[PDB]
Write a new protein. Sequence first.
Lengths: 601, 57, 464
Amino acid sequence: STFGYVHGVSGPVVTACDMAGAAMYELVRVGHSELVGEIIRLEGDMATIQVYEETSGVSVGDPVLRTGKPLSVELGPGIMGAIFDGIQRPLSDISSQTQSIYIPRGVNVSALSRDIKWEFIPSKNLRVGSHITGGDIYGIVNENSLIKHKIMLPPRSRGSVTYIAPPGNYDASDVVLELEFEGVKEKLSMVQVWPVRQVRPVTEKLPANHPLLTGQRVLDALFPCVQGGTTAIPGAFGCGKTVISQSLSKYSNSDVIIYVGCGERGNEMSEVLRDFPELTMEVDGKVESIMKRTALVANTSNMPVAAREASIYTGITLSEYFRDMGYHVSMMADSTSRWAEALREISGRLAEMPADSGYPAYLGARLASFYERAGRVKCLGNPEREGSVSIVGAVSPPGGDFSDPVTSATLGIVQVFWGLDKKLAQRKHFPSVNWLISYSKYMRALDEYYDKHFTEFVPLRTKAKEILQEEEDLAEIVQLVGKASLAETDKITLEVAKLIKDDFLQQNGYTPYDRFCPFYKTVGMLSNMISFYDMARRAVETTAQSDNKITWSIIREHMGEILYKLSSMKFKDPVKDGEAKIKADYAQLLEDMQNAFRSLE
Amino acid sequence: AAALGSHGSCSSEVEKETQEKMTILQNYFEQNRDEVLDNLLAFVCDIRPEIHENYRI
Amino acid sequence: NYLSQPRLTYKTVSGVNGPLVILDHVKFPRYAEIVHLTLPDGTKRSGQVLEVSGSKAVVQVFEGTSGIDAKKTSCEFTGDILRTPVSEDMLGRVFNGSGKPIDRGPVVLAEDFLDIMGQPINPQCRIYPEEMIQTGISAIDGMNSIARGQKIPIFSAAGLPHNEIAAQICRQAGLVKKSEENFAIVFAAMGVNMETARFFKSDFEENGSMDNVCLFLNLANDPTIERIITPRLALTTAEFLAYQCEKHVLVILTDMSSYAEALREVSAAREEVPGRRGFPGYMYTDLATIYERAGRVEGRNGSITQIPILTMPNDDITHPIPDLTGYITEGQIYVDRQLHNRQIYPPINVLPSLSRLMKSAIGEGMTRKDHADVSNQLYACYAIGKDVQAMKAVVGEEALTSDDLLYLEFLQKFEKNFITQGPYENRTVYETLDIGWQLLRIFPKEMLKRIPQSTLSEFYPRDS
């Protein structure tokens, strides 16, 4: 039978009998209200279930209905714009259908709606008898104005097409393909189902080559991430995380966005779910909602501990499904520290050996195996395509202690750290990225891209990092030397470090000219600031060696208009001024500064 | 004395309101108690024997 | 609809051990069911089914297991879990930690019966916090301001006045009265000694505020399960009053440190192994089930705001109870031993205290337009004043500048006038802000660098 029966209850643990063919880690529905749980032990014809919901009122002899599956995702049309929790309950459909402010115990709404009808177009040259394999695109659903949703044959499925549906409107429960292999027939609808703990297969996993642009001058120049990359950010109150989340959502070269809350505070989760629907972007000269290309997983701190832990596996499995269509995906996890605390609580319920700081022995392997799902890929199946998933995971070191087991593991794994900083936010220095603590390890992989497309940039990045580091060495000298007694070369360093810091690293995201900064504007600004620095250094070092010296005071007194034009470069608007117009103006500052230095020399 | 004295007399209206509110209870109860007794006694006499839903042969 | 079936009474007690009675031959046992025991002398006790297995049930008795035997003791299984009657008639009433009346009023007529475990609020239905809750205490309202739908703990230690502060917040709290009967309080107190419990009950009657207040008292020698039930009765009442009767409810939960001591004991009675630092491994998920019964919700005009109150051992903020509370709640109000020793009341320390939602509660149309600027400038002056006061003992007062002597004057008058307040003195936010400006006027207006020129122009000068 599909039913066993409750033999006993002790807190969240249920023991059931007549469970003989039930497999390890299957999901089950317990009692007359159908509470969800998972099988954690087998013994004889009995099973031990870890129930996710309150077991209060469950009785001996109550039905235990078994699902033949582990924890898994419905993958199909209806995911874009959706709100889910960590076990894929549709929070907005539950709200709409129940007319309640609460989540009912043992609620059993399907994650994708089976009453919405979708416009479906088949792949045109598939016919009865066509040979078809896992990952093959056999039709497209027009889900909205932005996302064409590509219907694929599941992994671990293959055969010869015995039926394919004509163009039309279909429920997610309608059969749209049948195929046959070894005389056995498989019938398929628009929804496939996949286990959250199994990595979705690919033809090949590839090195990451192309930047994940954000439109920020810092990040995109000094600390780049690739498409398929991995990043961590500090998750703390004052630092200002939202610039990462909103730049990814509005301005990245991602095709799809997945956001995971994984045990957040109720009032913080409410702020995300209020704010995200109000975000918009301009597509083909028309403004569109972010929720046409976005899905949210949301979990407050009083959701089931099984959901708070499943959350990142639900979010990465959704991300891998859109990668397999040939999209580029960014996934954000709102705090991996809240996920790790849920993992710790589960190991505590299981009475496991407490290892490092009370966290289970597998913590670092679970983090490693999760971040190993990031990357660029060659997809399974016939139409030849590439996709990627890029992961940003926030992490919350207690009091800023990076020796925390979750933070220590995370920075041991990730290839970028964007160190957002409360002290910079208190200075009104926005975006609040600390350039001393932050790093990127993708700078070699991007070398071929920058060489091909920009060519001048790698030298400029190298000089700019040195100038910002020299100022941090000169500061302790200035505290003794009293600024005036410093060398003129080093006064140039300090004041150009201030020029880069105030006019390149800072970027006011509320202002129309600086909401997004394209990479041509970014390299153009830096090119001029470093050109000015080299000419100012050359004027001092040519004269001060034996002639009547030039000084940084003489340069400022002679060149104050050039220095004002340099501070004005950030005000150029990429929408009102064309690429060629901005480039021509930035060439005019180079001509003007070269003329001004030639008149000084 | 100027703040308390007038309202000291008017505080007698709390007793007047107590008696009005109690009179409103009497009026509500005496109009409705026969429907309530007829419903209550009907639920007591309508027995309907049944076995527990977890029972199996 | 109704439960209708007659109850079974058993004399099938197999064994008795600690707080637990074990019965066999029980018909389809229900987990967490309430049962009534009658002892050999006719005394009555009650308990809850702690585990079931086949025909066996084990009951934790709320009162003792003394005088129980296997032969004459009978147990009546009620057929159902713990549900509380709930109504608006509960405002003006005093109850014990099992919901029984202790005020010589009658027992509650239900408008409904609710399961005390509740259900989680859907994240889609919770809307962001907004306007102020006015506590009447300047160190809170002026600088750690509380939003409708916030949750914010008071952190304290043994022998500090946190119950006197809680009682003052309960007597004084309300809405700001800009330019209501829709405000109520649920006050819950866990593991209270009889001196403290008599103080709470006496102080709210004597100072005449009971018509807004529902009060639940659990004493230090009441059953430890009633301490587990107490926050759940209180929050099941606040959920009826907020999300069905559309009130703004303030909930005060007193010694969550006493609650955790009972949670550790019920965990030990289940024969679980002790977790990290000796508390149950699931204590985060348990505390989060209390604290997230809070907020504003879409389409209903009520809200629940929580003020948990906690005692820390060794004055240590890194113990599991304050530490896990910090991951769930959004701020802290810090009660300080040094201000208490200096004879200041309320001894609230504004430098480590924070309300993370303060910007959502304050400003034009919610308090007054200058509130954010005054709060920022009072914090900035006090943080400098404590630093000048430290260097005065190193450099001597003759090495201090004229500006150091202004911070040294502000520091004394801030603590005597802004922080120091009477236990029966109630200041509106407007009075709090006006006391704030009397202190800022100690300085030349050039010193007030956290305040913009528009706010200085409207509020720095005195007027008739």
